[PDB]
Design a protein around this ligand. Sequence first.
Ligand SMILES: Cc1cc2nc3c(=O)[nH]c(=O)nc-3n(C[C@H](O)[C@H](O)[C@H](O)COP(=O)(O)OP(=O)(O)OC[C@H]3O[C@@H](n4cnc5c(N)ncnc54)[C@H](O)[C@@H]3O)c2cc1C
Ligand code: HEM
Ligand SMILES: *[C@@H]1O[C@H](CO)[C@@H](O)[C@H](O)[C@H]1NC(C)=O
Ligand SMILES: *[C@@H]1O[C@H](CO)[C@@H](O)[C@H](O)[C@H]1NC(C)=O
Ligand SMILES: *[C@@H]1O[C@H](CO)[C@@H](O)[C@H](O)[C@H]1NC(C)=O
Ligand SMILES: *[C@@H]1O[C@H](CO)[C@@H](O)[C@H](O)[C@H]1NC(C)=O
Ligand SMILES: *[C@H]1O[C@H](CO)[C@@H](O)[C@H](O)[C@@H]1O
Ligand SMILES: *[C@H]1O[C@H](CO)[C@@H](O)[C@H](O)[C@@H]1O
Ligand SMILES: *[C@H]1O[C@H](CO)[C@@H](O)[C@H](O)[C@@H]1O
Ligand SMILES: *[C@H]1O[C@H](CO)[C@@H](O)[C@H](O)[C@@H]1O
Ligand SMILES: *[C@H]1O[C@H](CO)[C@@H](O)[C@H](O)[C@@H]1O
Length: 800
Amino acid sequence: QNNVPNTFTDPDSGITFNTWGLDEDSPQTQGGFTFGVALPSDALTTDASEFIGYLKCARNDESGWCGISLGGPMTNSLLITAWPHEDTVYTSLRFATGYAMPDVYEGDAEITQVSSSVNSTHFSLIFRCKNCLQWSHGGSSGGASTSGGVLVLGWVQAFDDPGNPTCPEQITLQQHDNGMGIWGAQLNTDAASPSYTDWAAQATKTVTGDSVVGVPVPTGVSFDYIVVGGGAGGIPAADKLSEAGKSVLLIEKGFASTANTGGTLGPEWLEGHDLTRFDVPGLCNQIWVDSKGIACEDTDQMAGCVLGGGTAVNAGLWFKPYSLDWDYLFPDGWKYNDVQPAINRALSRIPGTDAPSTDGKRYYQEGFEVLSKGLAAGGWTSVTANNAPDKKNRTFAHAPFMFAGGERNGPLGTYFQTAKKRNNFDVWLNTSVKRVIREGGHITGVEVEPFRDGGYEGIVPVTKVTGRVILSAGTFGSAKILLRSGIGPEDQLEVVAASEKDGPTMIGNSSWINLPVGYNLDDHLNTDTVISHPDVVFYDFYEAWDDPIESDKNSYLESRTGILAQAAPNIGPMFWEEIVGADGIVRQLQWTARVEGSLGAPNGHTMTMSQYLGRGATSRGRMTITPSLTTIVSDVPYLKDPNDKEAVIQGIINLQNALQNVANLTWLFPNSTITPREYVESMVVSPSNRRSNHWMGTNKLGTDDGRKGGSAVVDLDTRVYGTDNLFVIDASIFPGVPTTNPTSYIVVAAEHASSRILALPDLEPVPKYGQCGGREWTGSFVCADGSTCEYQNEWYSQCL
Ligand SMILES: Cc1cc2nc3c(=O)[nH]c(=O)nc-3n(C[C@H](O)[C@H](O)[C@H](O)COP(=O)(O)OP(=O)(O)OC[C@H]3O[C@@H](n4cnc5c(N)ncnc54)[C@H](O)[C@@H]3O)c2cc1C
Ligand code: HEM
Ligand SMILES: *[C@@H]1O[C@H](CO)[C@@H](O)[C@H](O)[C@H]1NC(C)=O
Ligand SMILES: *[C@@H]1O[C@H](CO)[C@@H](O)[C@H](O)[C@H]1NC(C)=O
Ligand SMILES: *[C@@H]1O[C@H](CO)[C@@H](O)[C@H](O)[C@H]1NC(C)=O
Ligand SMILES: *[C@@H]1O[C@H](CO)[C@@H](O)[C@H](O)[C@H]1NC(C)=O
Ligand SMILES: *[C@H]1O[C@H](CO)[C@@H](O)[C@H](O)[C@@H]1O
Ligand SMILES: *[C@H]1O[C@H](CO)[C@@H](O)[C@H](O)[C@@H]1O
Ligand SMILES: *[C@H]1O[C@H](CO)[C@@H](O)[C@H](O)[C@@H]1O
Ligand SMILES: *[C@H]1O[C@H](CO)[C@@H](O)[C@H](O)[C@@H]1O
Ligand SMILES: *[C@H]1O[C@H](CO)[C@@H](O)[C@H](O)[C@@H]1O
């Protein structure tokens, strides 16, 4: 939709609105969308509580529905839902913690109606929302301030119609397949009217209507290592541990993904050759249109919960690490010279490929040829991505992948395969870990509950004394486990205490460790741009799911070759440049070109280039947790430091200087009339639109003790401060986001950290009368036999 509002007068009720919305034939939503607001008189100065609004929604083949997010993200915001049934339009206010079925809003809000109009192609509405702007649901409290002059809103539309469209509260829905978006909505002189109460009392309508399998833990079972989660860092770590001969258990909350992991689920034409939906690179883009049973429901962001984690559902981009990243982002011992052997071990398993097709050819390069030769004339040098990892400035290349055999490979096809064939390695799927149970600073076992049927219920102990637990659960995952284990900031630990789920069963206050868990939240800032060229050829990977092209289908199913052997959409040239700020700090930009429509530009002749803001970004956010025990982003990391925004703008400036030599090339986003500065600042800054989906830094690696008021969570051994046997290997430990897409960096970190943990001497229990604990205490937290750990004060604990 349109940013600058539009004054619109509805004749019958005589009510005035400020209307934003899209149109019928715009390549965003089918049937168009329009929304508006009627506020109180004082709204533009002091915040309004209730309001009045106008909904014009699409109806496709006499079927559909639409929704409004008042906060504008789907998660943790008050949602308005409307669908036609016969003449009557129905409304149910909902609330959604993660990406999933929103539950009925339990707050004080109420909907009343003025007018109802339903025809074949459309159903409109004029209603009144009371106590809607300020909302509270189950401990979560949101709000919308009309005082600022702008209102961030969000919208959806759909084709199918809900489960029975009679009772608003009990309806069932599926993912909205027509359109979605977030836009800042500005208000003006016509938003606030003195007649508001005559219009408010004019709404006379109140619309009416009419467990999991618990399989227990085996008897005498214990493990030298328990690795939680099968993600990017988990599978490589558990593999190297099992290689050493240690008895290792890998606990994954999801199910089998790729066909070599025992996978089943996949499209219709993949039946019989052992290919799943995850294995085919051309079908990788379907995770956006289908999240069912895959995406994590406990996070407000998007993360794959299946086996392999993000590596299963991602594009598969795999890069050889820039040496400057490890030097800049990490302390001594994690630097480049230190992680050099880790890089060699990781790339020997998964060497990069810039030609994913098994015949060593690239397909539909028409889009690539336009930008490549254009950037070459722009003064940018062409390189092979993994043959020159250390040239990131003014340069481009083909997209390297973790693929091989023409299929999605990753840690699933290398690290996991060698792991599954050993004796000492074991995997528990459909099983989520609630917490780690611990006495003082020593973890005994982990507490599991089934996420699905065939899951495990109980407590599985580590080998006595020596046993170690590794948290691979991920950026949001590992932080949630630590918080329910009594480890983290005070405010968040008290949230877990007041929760219904973990409330009565939580550990004692005296055992709480205070670490900045959830802080140092970072990510690549994403800024999309769109160009249009006559020579660019679009390929549809979405219709390839149900009905693949005859040629290309047989090409992949036989020789594992063709356009379906490539990621979706077709990923064009990747170029980087390093920008020096006024603060002296070098910030890294990475552009990713692909052939698709993005911002509402048509698909065929257009290419989208996404700009990631990498290493050098000083801005940080924070991850918190709800009493529902769901992970949300309380503070958005992007664009805090003003010097970060300057780097983004300059990147667009220099890119336009390089690509302006190209004939017939057209810039859709931004248009020719908008300067790159005006285009960046007029954009909305939110986790939804601006995320690159790469999340790192919730548990920070550093030498500065977090208990002493430092920023670190885990030390240089990736071990949690205040604990001898607990370790964390995943993207969460990265102090900042690297130059490039993080997956390859995380697997390397897994290789490096696993080597350190193995090298560590076995834990030796503290003898009687010794000091087993303290808030400054480094050493062994476990007491010798015949002795227990007694808490005196925060600074001291003794073996007795
Ligand atoms: C769609 C998508 C596109 C992306 N594109 C790329 C790309 O092309 N290339 C690239 O470099 N990066 C890409 N990434 C980013 C990358 O996938 C992640 O940053 C990376 O996987 C992080 O790894 P992790 O181990 O820290 O977390 P994850 O990979 O998510 O691993 C966490 C695992 O733990 C499991 N789990 C979580 N909680 C629990 C629990 N409590 N108990 C038991 N198990 C649990 C989950 O099932 C999951 O399998 C993309 C990400 C997404 C989602
Ligand atoms: C059960 C039905 C629903 C499912 C399965 C669902 C799932 C999702 C998923 C997976 C995304 C992100 C997709 C992506 O990142 O590409 C999303 C985004 C969105 N959803 Fe929900 N949703 C549902 C119902 C709704 C409802 C009822 C509303 C509000 C009335 C809503 C508003 C939004 C908006 C505005 C976005 C885009 C902004 C954002 O990503 O947060 N959705 N939905
Ligand atoms: C996990 O659940 C899936 C479906 O929910 C099932 O197909 C699979 O067999 C289960 N795995 C185990 C180990 O129970
Ligand atoms: C126990 O709770 C209090 C506040 O209720 C908090 O100040 C204290 O730090 C907690 N104990 C520990 C060991 O953190
Ligand atoms: C990258 O190259 C450009 C062009 O030569 C130069 O202006 C810029 O300073 C370089 N960046 C760094 C970090 O050296
Ligand atoms: C300039 O941008 C506006 C709004 O984004 C758009 O309506 C207009 O079409 C653009 N200009 C051109 C020439 O397309
Ligand atoms: C709304 O209605 C009032 C009367 O209550 C008018 O005075 C105003 O101009 C607007 O039409
Ligand atoms: C509704 O109520 C307000 C409250 O004063 C009036 O100003 C308005 O004219 C209408 O009667
Ligand atoms: C409730 O009453 C109003 C008049 O105040 C009507 O306009 C409306 O259609 C509903 O019957
Ligand atoms: C419809 O029903 C609600 C019930 O709360 C009333 O408040 C409203 O005035 C209308 O009668
Ligand atoms: C626990 O008990 C089982 C039988 O239920 C044994 O097989 C196992 O070795 C352990 O003693």
